[PDB]
Amino acid sequence: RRALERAETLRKAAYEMAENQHERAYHKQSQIFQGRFLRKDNARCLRFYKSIGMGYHTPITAINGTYIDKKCPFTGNVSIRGRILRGVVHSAKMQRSIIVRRDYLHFVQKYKRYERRHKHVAAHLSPCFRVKEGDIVTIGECRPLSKTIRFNVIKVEPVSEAAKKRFSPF
Amino acid sequence: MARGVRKHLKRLNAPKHWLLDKMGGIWAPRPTNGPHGLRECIPLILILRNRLHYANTYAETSMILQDKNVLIDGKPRTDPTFPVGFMDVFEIPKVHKTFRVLYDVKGRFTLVPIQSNEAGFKLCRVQKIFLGDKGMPYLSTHDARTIRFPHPDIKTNDTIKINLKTGKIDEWYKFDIGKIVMVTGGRNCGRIGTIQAIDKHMGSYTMIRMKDTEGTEFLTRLCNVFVIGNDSPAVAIPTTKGIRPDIIKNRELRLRSI
Amino acid sequence: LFKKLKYPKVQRVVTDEKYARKQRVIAEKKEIMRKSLQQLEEYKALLSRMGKQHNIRIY
Amino acid sequence: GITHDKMYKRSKTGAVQGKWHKKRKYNLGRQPANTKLIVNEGQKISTIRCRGGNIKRRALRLSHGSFAWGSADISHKARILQVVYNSTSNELVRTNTLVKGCVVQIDSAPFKSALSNDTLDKEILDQIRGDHILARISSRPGQVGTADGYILEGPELLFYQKKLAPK
RNA sequence: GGCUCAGGACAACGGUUGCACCCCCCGCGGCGGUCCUAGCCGGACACCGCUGGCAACCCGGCGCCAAGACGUGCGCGCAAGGGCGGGCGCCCGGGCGAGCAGCGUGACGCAGCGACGGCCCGCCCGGGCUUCCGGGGCAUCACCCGGUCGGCGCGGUCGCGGCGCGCCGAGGGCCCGACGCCUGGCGGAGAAUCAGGGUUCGACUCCGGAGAGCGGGCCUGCGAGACGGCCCGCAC
Ligand SMILES: [Mg+2]
Ligand SMILES: [Mg+2]
Ligand SMILES: [Mg+2]
Ligand SMILES: [Mg+2]
Ligand SMILES: [Mg+2]
Ligand SMILES: [Mg+2]
Ligand SMILES: [Mg+2]
Hints:
part of a larger assembly; 4 chains; A: 170 residues; alpha+beta; five-stranded antiparallel beta sheet; B: 258 residues; 3 domains; 30% strand; globular; binds magnesium ion; RNA-binding; 40S ribosomal protein S6 (chain C)
């Protein structure tokens, strides 16, 4: 019975989407062959998802969600490869993108002391994740998605609001 | 930004283990493409001129090679810049000399004279298993040799014994703990040891730990670990069994020889 | 169409050795195909305990 | 001439970057093919010598293509009648220009020649009884020289029907 | 290969990643099934003979002949592209850290090789872009950007990408110094000096980058925005 409820919920999302005439085009998952939704039995899978590997687990929201994102690392058509980094959220104002703040130390040999430095890194945030300012995120490297974006969010660790901004190298 | 591929090689930019003299000349030979690449090979002329001393100039080496007096795995080669590599066969029938190209403890190429019982084959390291046209399985080796329809039991990083006469596999050595290996690159080139641990890091290099027979222990990455048999070596090895002496011991040896 | 003696050398004449060369080439190609077929057959006979995926010859 | 180099763009902060070399042939571009539906006339396709000696062909005019009905597994070669919708601009539709993603009308003769009676998807049978069937383009003309696709069905068919019904 | 350092100040460059977004001549090793006159096919030009223009540079017309040149092509179905083919919380072979490859089947299309057989695949060197860190001075430069920031769709490219176009929303950077201006600014490996800590320089031998009077465009070719290759404007 649990699978049946999922299929009905997914099926509605496809048909209420066709009633949003404001949209210029019909957005779909490339892997799934439209036409399975005309089958009354639940003999076929209606949603596609994958495991990115490296020990990370797929969120239940992506598996049970009703959203389309070709740049998502779980339901889209991109692959994670290279460097995995961490940081805190700096701004979340774009449609599906954020700015990540990274902090590190730089050593000066003449004075035998350090300097605190930071860089800004832009990344893509899939709808499966909810993020506010100050949370800690883990980002994986992918192929160029835009002029400044080469990373994708993979894990979010909430932080309490009102907490003190602190220098947090990661 | 050069408009095309490079064809020259300055003497100072050449690999160190070739041991070219600084003032020999401005230029150095540029090996052509072949079984082995630039950084893991050595041109034929260097062996024929600066090692065996059979020739004193480029022209003599070219004449000798044209006369087809040198065989490399049973096939005469006329290219003065043909690249020679590890676990090759170097036989000169006209002087009844047969050698196998290996690495010395110091990390240089050496010629180990061999017998006829073991001079009709070579050992190859398998680096890749891929599907070719029509889904037919294949395999590739460190010497740029591709074999079709191999045994399923053969996996990556194994060692393969191919007969030179025909070019067919006869047996293979699995990659496992307790198998004698030889290091083919890095700071530990030429050493012989036995695998003791295999530690794999996700998304990065795999590290191999082996112990020398005397008791020494050293580490290297899997990309330059070469199995040369089970427990005991399948092929001949230089006089010293891959034991690198210390500076003090080497200085004592030098003084003794002086 | 139909001192020294100078005449042009004839071209496009098929003497004995051309026939032998063509026959040898044909035989070599035929035996190559036969050996490949035999190797495929023996490999297929092997793998009795595993799957396989090769392009089946049509016709 | 035409280039896709990033050296002529501004930086993420909005600053202007200096030009430190001349134009290179790695980063060149070419004019669009603008493939036109036929509706000295015939199919015309051109060949282009690309980098490495590779060959690329752009269609300038075509009239036919292969279309597949996935649900019943029926594929035939059909004639394209005209473009009726495009998600990028109405000007492409007016000019009858073929690109990937275009929604077109194909002749129903090949598909009504058989299985006009078999109980399949009802929404497609009604189209079969008529003269044209809504379809979509899946290939990239201008790169491969073909215009292939599939017959619509499911939610997308309803979406496009509602889109182009009130007109 | 050789010459030089004009240009260019989040760029070039140095170390460290990646292409599951890529191209690659020679060489080495494999592979080699091709739908519908083969004792061996067809026509030309070059050089050359005759005949000529023009100060030079340059070429014209007629005429028999060769190919490892050009064209056609004997041949056991095969190029590119396109539709369909896995799950029910996650994990526990061709191959991976990673659903990546290959294959079957329904439709299209007949690309390449073949008048002394090589299309194709792998390696190799090389290139293209790309991750992280470093990367001049002036605050009598304090606010700057408007394809500028992001999303959707198509096109083009060897290929990802505001690279370009249409629509949508608004964003992005900054005293941890943005933007602007200046430099008698190519960078590094390194050089001079000398308790230790440091200061100054770095046209020139090795590596990398850029250019061939200034600014643009392009053919050939695997590979050039080539200049001891061609076209245009300007100045000589
Ligand atoms: Mg035929
Ligand atoms: Mg021919
Ligand atoms: Mg200057
Ligand atoms: Mg230089
Ligand atoms: Mg140049
Ligand atoms: Mg030029
Ligand atoms: Mg030149």
